[PDB]
């Protein structure tokens, strides 16, 4: 059909970010009804959230909230999608 890839509406957080706060990360599609994959570090994620982290639907709109960024957090951060693929590292720095 028409080579019309899934634009990523919302880059991963690029900002370098602190242990103990609460980070919320955005990335959302441009086109709704569209899931995507979460890659985290090189380890493809589990399909389910916790009280760690969890993320939220929204049609088109997806939300990652990270309660406490940690040390286990402080990993890269990647988006798959079949269309554009989203791809961001965090640094995520110790107190």
């Known amino acids: 059909g028409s080579h019309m890839p899934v634009l990523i509406t919302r880059p991963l957080e690029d900002q370098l970010v602190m242990v103990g706060q609460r980070v919320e990360f955005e990335c959302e599609v441009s086109e709704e009804g569209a899931q995507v994959k979460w890659l985290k ?13 969890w993320f939220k639907k929204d049609g088109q709109r997806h939300h990652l909230i990270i309660n406490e960024a940690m040390l286990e957090d402080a990993g890269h951060y990647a988006l798959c999608t079949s269309g554009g693929q989203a791809l961001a590292e965090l640094i995520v720095q110790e107190k």
């Not at 570090?41 to 982290?53: A, H, I, N, Q």
Request: aromatic share 16%.
């Open 41 to 53: 570090d090189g380890v493809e994620l589990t399909r389910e959230e916790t009280f760690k982290y």
